Design a protein around this ligand. Sequence first.
Ligand SMILES: O=C(Nc1ccc2c(c1)CNC2)c1cccc2nc(C(F)(F)F)[nH]c12
Lengths: 39, 156
Amino acid sequence: DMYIERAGDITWEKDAEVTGNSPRLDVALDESGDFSLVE
Amino acid sequence: GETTDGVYRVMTRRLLGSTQVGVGVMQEGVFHTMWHVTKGAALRSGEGRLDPYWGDVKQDLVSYCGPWKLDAAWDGLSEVQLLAVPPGERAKNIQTLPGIFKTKDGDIGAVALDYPAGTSGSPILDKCGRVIGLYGNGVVIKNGSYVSAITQGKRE
Ligand SMILES: O=C(Nc1ccc2c(c1)CNC2)c1cccc2nc(C(F)(F)F)[nH]c12
């Protein structure tokens, strides 16, 4: 049995930690909702 | 029980202790999460019960109590915020510029932030605070890191 607990508000926060890159990837989506890399 | 708008953790007591299996968005009385988090099972909110209303394995989305309400979209140019809710850790906003998943049926935004699988369902936001999609369905790149798509449903 699954249950939900509140974790916070949904708001944009100024001066948030900026990280992560922006890759352009060739992907395929199968009938089971799983992505895979195409090269 | 609790229907207040906001981000929520999805827990289970079926394994050892209390385990966070995912996250979700409560908006307009509807709970939005990723299909692989709940597998379409019923949810509990204190004494109340949330029943699935719509869902689709290919999109990897599911809504509870009503139809999917989230319809904001990434503009293709601006930075976004992953409001990450990791297991055992406090909710935290992470700003990033999304990449692109190029598919045979069009391009989808993608966020390259690596978080535990139990973070699946955490919302991705625009500058206005609107939910443009959920984190938790993507691919594993050569480095071993996870790159998730910005998965958005359709508001009917
Ligand atoms: O596995 C994940 N997501 C998912 C699971 C089951 C299904 C789907 C997606 C769609 N069809 C059913 C996942 C989500 C978030 C961070 C993740 N890190 C890893 C890791 F370890 F592989 F790097 N998987 C992660």
